[PDB]
């Protein structure tokens, strides 16, 4: 399970689009409140892609449905905060679509 959680989470991070650019590069580590205070006031549950591997190294996630619940939470946290049609908005739309195809390949094949 931890290996599959590492595979699912590492496939979403390593995933490059059809111009060669990695999408997760912004979603790797959150900004300091000092840097961007508006995001923290807007967002209830600040979570990034390291905070999720940290959980996975601690195996904080119980099932593959608990790992998904908090990848949808940050990808939806991004959408709420950002402008519709922004660079960061449509990649959290793709990172939800690449996580939902990555969990569907590892968990049942």
């Amino acid at each position: 399970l931890t290996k599959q959680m590492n595979a699912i989470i590492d496939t979403v991070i390593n995933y490059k689009d059809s111009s060669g650019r990695q999408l997760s590069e912004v979603f790797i580590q959150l900004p300091s409140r000092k840097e961007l205070p508006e995001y923290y006031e807007l967002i209830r549950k600040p979570v990034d892609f390291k905070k999720i591997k940290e959980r996975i190294r601690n195996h904080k996630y119980r099932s593959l449905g608990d790992l998904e619940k908090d990848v949808m939470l940050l990808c939806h946290n991004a959408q709420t905060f950002n402008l519709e049609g922004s660079q960061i908005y449509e990649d959290s739309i793709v990172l939800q679509s690449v996580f939902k195809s990555a969990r569907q390949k590892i968990a049942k094949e």
């Binding site: 950002n82 402008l83 660079q87």
Partner: protein
């Protein structure tokens, strides 16, 4: 498709207005909505703080006529090399004689009087179709979907 990219990496730029017109710098925001910025008088230049990947566009503040920057329609500052500033050279394009005439007529005659000119009906419509950032953005998109 045509939008700035949130970058975090500053790119100092020099807006140089080498048109005879007052220039309206237009920054495309992250959603890709035109944002008017402070105007450059003719023959002036300013250093401005912008970011890498930010997309800009320039126009005649008065008429909203199309201008050019470094012989093209969009300007996107590259990453600065060794701190030296990138340069945005803003100039007239070579307008069609027609479009240029429209410009002059439009500037002399009140829009409600376009109807009094002894010209063809098509020309009235052309006169009334004032140039516009959004119309031009739509065109520029189809010109980039045609290069793909």
């Amino acid at each position: 498709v045509l939008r700035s990219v949130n970058s975090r990496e500053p790119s100092q730029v020099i807006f140089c207005n080498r048109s005879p017109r007052v220039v309206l710098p237009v920054w495309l925001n992250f959603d890709g909505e035109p944002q008017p910025y402070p105007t450059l008088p003719p023959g002036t230049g300013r250093r401005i703080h912008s970011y890498r990947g930010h997309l800009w566009l320039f126009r005649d503040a008065g008429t909203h006529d199309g201008l050019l920057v470094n012989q093209t329609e969009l300007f996107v500052p590259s990453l600065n090399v060794d701190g030296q500033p990138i340069f945005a050279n803003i100039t007239l394009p070579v307008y069609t004689l027609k479009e240029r005439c429209l410009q002059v007529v439009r500037s002399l005659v009140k829009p409600e009087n376009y109807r009094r000119l002894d010209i063809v009906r098509s020309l009235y419509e052309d006169l009334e179709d004032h140039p516009n950032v959004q119309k031009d953005l739509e065109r520029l998109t189809q010109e980039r979907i045609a290069h793909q």
